[PDB]
Amino acid sequence: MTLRAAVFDLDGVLALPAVFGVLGRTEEALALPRGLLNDAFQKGGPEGATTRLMKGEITLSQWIPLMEENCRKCSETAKVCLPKNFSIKEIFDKAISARKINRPMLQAALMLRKKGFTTAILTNTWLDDRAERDGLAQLMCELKMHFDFLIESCQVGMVKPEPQIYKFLLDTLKASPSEVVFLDDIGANLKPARDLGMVTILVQDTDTALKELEKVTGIQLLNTPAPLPTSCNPSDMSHGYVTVKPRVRLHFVELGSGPAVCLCHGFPESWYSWRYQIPALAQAGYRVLAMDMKGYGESSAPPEIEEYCMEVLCKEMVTFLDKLGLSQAVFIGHDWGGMLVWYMALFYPERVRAVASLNTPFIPANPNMSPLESIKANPVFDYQLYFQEPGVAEAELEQNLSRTFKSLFRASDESVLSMHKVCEAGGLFVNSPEEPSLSRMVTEEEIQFYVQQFKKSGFRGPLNWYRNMERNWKWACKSLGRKILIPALMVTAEKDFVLVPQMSQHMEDWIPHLKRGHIEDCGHWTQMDKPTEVNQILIKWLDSDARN
Amino acid sequence: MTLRAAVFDLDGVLALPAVFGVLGRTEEALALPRGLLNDAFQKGGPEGATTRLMKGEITLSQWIPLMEENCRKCSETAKVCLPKNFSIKEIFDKAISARKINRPMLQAALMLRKKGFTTAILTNTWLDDRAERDGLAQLMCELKMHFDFLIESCQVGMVKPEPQIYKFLLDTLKASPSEVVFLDDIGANLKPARDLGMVTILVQDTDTALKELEKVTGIQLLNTPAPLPTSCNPSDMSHGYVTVKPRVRLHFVELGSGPAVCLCHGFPESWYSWRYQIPALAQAGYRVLAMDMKGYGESSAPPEIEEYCMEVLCKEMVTFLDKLGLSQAVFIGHDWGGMLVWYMALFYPERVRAVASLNTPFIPANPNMSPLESIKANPVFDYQLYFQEPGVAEAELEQNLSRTFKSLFRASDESVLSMHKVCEAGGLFVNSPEEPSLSRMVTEEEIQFYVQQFKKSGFRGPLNWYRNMERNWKWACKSLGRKILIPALMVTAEKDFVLVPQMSQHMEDWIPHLKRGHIEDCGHWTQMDKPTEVNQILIKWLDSDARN
Ligand SMILES: Cc1cc(C)c(S(=O)(=O)N2CCC(C(=O)NC3CCCCCC3)CC2)c(C)c1
Ligand SMILES: Cc1cc(C)c(S(=O)(=O)N2CCC(C(=O)NC3CCCCCC3)CC2)c(C)c1
Ligand SMILES: [Mg+2]
Numbered sequence A, B: 001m002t003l004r005a006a007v008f009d010l011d012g013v014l015a016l017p018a019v020f021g022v023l024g025r026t027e028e029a030l031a032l033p034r035g036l037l038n039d040a041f042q043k044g045g046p047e048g049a050t051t052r053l054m055k056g057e058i059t060l061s062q063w064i065p066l067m068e069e070n071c072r073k074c075s076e077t078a079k080v081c082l083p084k085n086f087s088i089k090e091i092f093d094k095a096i097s098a099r100k101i102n103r104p105m106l107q108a109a110l111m112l113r114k115k116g117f118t119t120a121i122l123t124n125t126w127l128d129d130r131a132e133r134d135g136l137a138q139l140m141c142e143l144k145m146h147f148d149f150l151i152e153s154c155q156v157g158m159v160k161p162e163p164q165i166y167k168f169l170l171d172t173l174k175a176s177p178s179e180v181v182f183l184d185d186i187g188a189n190l191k192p193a194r195d196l197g198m199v200t201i202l203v204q205d206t207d208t209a210l211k212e213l214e215k216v217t218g219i220q221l222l223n224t225p226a227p228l229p230t231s232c233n234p235s236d237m238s239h240g241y242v243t244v245k246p247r248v249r250l251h252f253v254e255l256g257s258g259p260a261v262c263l264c265h266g267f268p269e270s271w272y273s274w275r276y277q278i279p280a281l282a283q284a285g286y287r288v289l290a291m292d293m294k295g296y297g298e299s300s301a302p303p304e305i306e307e308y309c310m311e312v313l314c315k316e317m318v319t320f321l322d323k324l325g326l327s328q329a330v331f332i333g334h335d336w337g338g339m340l341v342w343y344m345a346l347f348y349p350e351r352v353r354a355v356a357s358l359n360t361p362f363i364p365a366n367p368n369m370s371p372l373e374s375i376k377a378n379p380v381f382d383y384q385l386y387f388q389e390p391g392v393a394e395a396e397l398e399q400n401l402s403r404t405f406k407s408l409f410r411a412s413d414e415s416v417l418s419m420h421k422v423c424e425a426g427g428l429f430v431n432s433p434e435e436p437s438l439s440r441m442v443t444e445e446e447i448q449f450y451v452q453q454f455k456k457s458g459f460r461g462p463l464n465w466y467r468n469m470e471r472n473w474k475w476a477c478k479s480l481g482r483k484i485l486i487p488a489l490m491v492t493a494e495k496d497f498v499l500v501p502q503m504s505q506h507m508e509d510w511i512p513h514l515k516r517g518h519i520e521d522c523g524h525w526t527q528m529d530k531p532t533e534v535n536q537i538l539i540k541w542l543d544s545d546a547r548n
């Protein structure tokens, strides 16, 4: 055979503690006759309560009392009597919520898909109408985004040992029997797959099943390296648009429910720079609002410089909350977004549930010295002087959009840009390659997404964030007597050689309850460089500080 | 004078229990020297802790301990000692949350705006960084959407008796002193308004203040009738877009935070048909997702009939939840939307937190009789036979979009359409007016919004919802053994002469825990006919059943 499709059972394969493993444990726990609960569950066979449930003829809450019945009649003819407060509902609630995603099996499914396989879930399951049904809904949700097809018995009206369901499977997959693998924890469910000619795998322990699937598929599945978190396909996201002013519309991508978390990218980036965290934080119980900041992507990019001072940027973000009907949001920002997010904490604390910045420290304005001098004080900020003169940086950055982003988006050990003496050399790329190699951090496709976005407005808007140093300074000086006393996290990146960790060292003087995070071996593009640890740090901090 | 601007103080005018009325009560409660708490609050005058707070130099949490200090020093030189567990923080938390919107004053502000006035709030307030700051944030949010300007002392760095702030007020309003009224509970704040020439009103009891504002403005404010709920301006809403299929994008308008409530309009309507409930439910603590259903507005309208059978409509709504990262939503629908929403409960109960329909009852398919006969059984459903032949209803409904909607959208006592014998007469409008009068229920502007929307795709898509009777019937027959056991509400409209209340009378046979609502004097367009009672019924049911 030559396989191009993988089908996975749910209970017992993609989801562990199998629910028959609660049927079984409960018998022992209560010292019931062996298999009594499993007798009652299968009573009637093809035309019994359970098959009707699995076929979607009745709902789970309809089925509970039919099963209680069968536990009575099996408890009559098996010659016992049930314990006084015996509750089938309670046994299944525990079983159902005890069940979790079998992560190695999901990873194996991912890998196969990644290498061109069509994947599907085939499961005997039920229309769940219990009060506590959201648990399983969530689980099914997380799973289904990773597969081409989810085939539920109660949705198709067919059940799983019936040959007809495998005919439906094959037709859904557009495959010949011998082109597909099918893993299931039950022998009887595999026999029919075999008769059409499908490869099959009895799934007992996960590891051995994968070994078989490795052999039969010829792709490394077990022991393979730690994989990146789920990314976003732009065209599958919910896109949102809010006018904040007559000529200014802000765009964002939205995913998940619960407390609002507003993500704010830096220069020269995009909502897409959060691609690795949007799914993770949604999964962690949050409503992510990933912005195209003003000047970028599908947000408006008005040409005037002062449209990008921190004060009008912040007010607009308040209007954004206003129009969305949000009293507050958690504000997490990187680079320029990080700066803005501190200023939202200082100027609109009532609207900020919590504040977090990646890389960008909070340094207060020096009310004596001008910032245009402070920026000459540090050689590594020379590039910001090159950004001042409208037009010059635009022409360089916009003449080869692919080159610009390939050159910028690199890990700390892949540098092709000497940040010092950029005014002298006369360009950010003066002695850098015309066709740079692709970084480890980004696929050609991902880069081209940025290229696509910057073809809308280019770099005027984005560069203007650097062109209000004096105005931002005057504004910031109004906050010099305040402190940030709302919940706040600072995340430093070891090998960000411009927004260096030591710049953050006095931040607790103004943010006394500041919580920190630090990431080893992480360059300036924190999110796409160390997505796993970023997700881990933020989710930890969100749950402890932005919640309860 | 001739006024065209009204300015309202917040504390004591737009918001009641004034916070000085907690300062005062607390002194009495604890038997402290009269005014001690108010001495400590104003200690230092123009350069005291409180003025610095009001000017935004320090935050509220910075101010608490400075005020505790002043309560100590006033408690020294006034010759007493404070009670053992005296907490300034606790006194203000209670005061701040005890304060609510003064509804009659807000109504008066509304009215004035409605009649052309520019309105503004001018308030001495603070950067609020308390743990419990969301309370006040919410309040400020509800208020500010109803005014042209919110001027906060701590935002502008000026405070309210200082003449400079009134210069800023006047400049913000683009008005001459004598063109503006200003109401405040404090005498000193009015003197400066007077010196520039402003009309002023010392606000003691609300009713008398309004009487003065009635006299000075010449518009009836007090005792005026019960006003409609807040509506939506389309261009101020957050618009959202989700691709559910290659050729099908669904659009919706989104407002509020908390549990997801998905609103589903009927035929031939729009997200805009929920204009009266979107704000109310957001305010009640919900995240409203008001759909353009498939076939309408900015949602895709594919021409094929079968793209509109209930089964593909429901699946698409699941994908909509999937892509948005929502495990569940509360589903509330009207007319056709109502039908779909029951079928979401029957086929995807795990995804439906709760279900509610306006007007549309749940009747199960008769598995013997064909629906195309059942629809001939009732003379009032004759119009549905007229909708069957593709093209005929389209030409009539699309030839004068304004006439179509003016003719349709009418209250029960304004009927211009005989629903019976539409096939016979050969048209829904055969003997109806070319230029109908405007209903009580809709402004010319509101109608034109529908006209604008239907110019995109017209009526093919919308009419196709009626063109899958046989297909919907076959599908529905699969549910004949199920019951709806999730939380469910049915709202009947007395004078809907087609979706009549008596059609609902057996619904508890399949929905045993069904909760009901009934609206007197309400026609078919429930939402725009009786918005107040609809909002009241849904919010009540949401809080008791879709929540905790
Ligand atoms: C070696 C090197 C690496 C990198 C990433 C760049 S960069 O692409 O131009 N770059 C882009 C973003 C830049 C940046 O603007 N950083 C922050 C902005 C927030 C306020 C505080 C001032 C500085 C920092 C680094 C440069 C110029 C050199
Ligand atoms: C007197 C009169 C009043 C009204 C509102 C109309 S109507 O505009 O055509 N109209 C539009 C919507 C229509 C309607 O489609 N109602 C429901 C749809 C859900 C499934 C059950 C079948 C019937 C009901 C009433 C008609 C034709 C006559
Ligand atoms: Mg299984």
Ligand SMILES: [Mg+2]
Pocket: B009, B010, B011, B012, B013, B184, B185, B186
């Ligand atoms: Mg006042």
